[PDB]
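Exercise 7. Predict the structure of phospho-tyrosine phosphatase 1B from Homo sapiens.
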Amino acid sequence: EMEKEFEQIDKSGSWAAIYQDIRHEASDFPCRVAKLPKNKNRNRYRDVSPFDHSRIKLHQEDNDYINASLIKMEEAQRSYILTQGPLPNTCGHFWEMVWEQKSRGVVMLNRVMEKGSLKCAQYWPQKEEKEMIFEDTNLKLTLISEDIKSYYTVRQLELENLTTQETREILHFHYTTWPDFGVPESPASFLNFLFKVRESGSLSPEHGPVVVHSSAGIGRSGTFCLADTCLLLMDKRKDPSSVDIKKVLLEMRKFRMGLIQTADQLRFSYLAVIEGAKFIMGDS
Ligand SMILES: [Cl-]
Ligand SMILES: [Cl-]
Ligand SMILES: [Cl-]
Ligand SMILES: [Cl-]
Ligand SMILES: [Cl-]
Ligand SMILES: [Mg+2]
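Solution. The predicted structure, encoded as tokens:
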């Protein structure tokens, strides 16, 4: 019914109303830790906080707080860490989380600067010879390689725990062609980017959850996980047409508030899961 509904909703013009309905029905759990006075500067927005139940804790004694949630989808058998776009003061925390949660990939869907606005801190080194050292979390990050394609860029970064000198390779998947405003006209490059992230094995049970982060203004980390989880479901269930994107989204929203930030992203999501289920069906 995916396309049937899409068409009805699109024809009747009820996207904002359908999106609003999800906002009203979405889970509401406490974010006590996120709201503590000491963590005011660790949050980009007071309106996007991690629920206490699913928040990612840093293994620091001082303050274990970071604005990030573990989204665990049982049926799809996929975990993701959804976090806000790093802040200038939270980059060491961000990588500390990447390190501690043993993540293999970091997924980014914004450019650091869009239309003259800073969307998130420059949290990774853009130059191989200029590595970054986060002294608060005692970690070093070095750009190792960088493969730049049309719609996206994959980078190999090296994360080093200066305490132990242990090093790890993190894949940075940077989708760079997301429009300044609105959602992409076509879910083509988005889906390709997703299939590429999947191919790296970064979403594999063998690693910690992939970290997908948001960006200032209207974030889009949610689309990536929603589309990805939906496809997994269509491919795993007997009846692929039994996959309810709205229900899946509500399920994810039980782990982090606000996933899918606008009606357009919800529509774009319907779209991407549709075309994508097409590929994974016709090709795969
Ligand atoms: Cl920022
Ligand atoms: Cl939008
Ligand atoms: Cl953000
Ligand atoms: Cl989101
Ligand atoms: Cl919302
Ligand atoms: Mg150079």
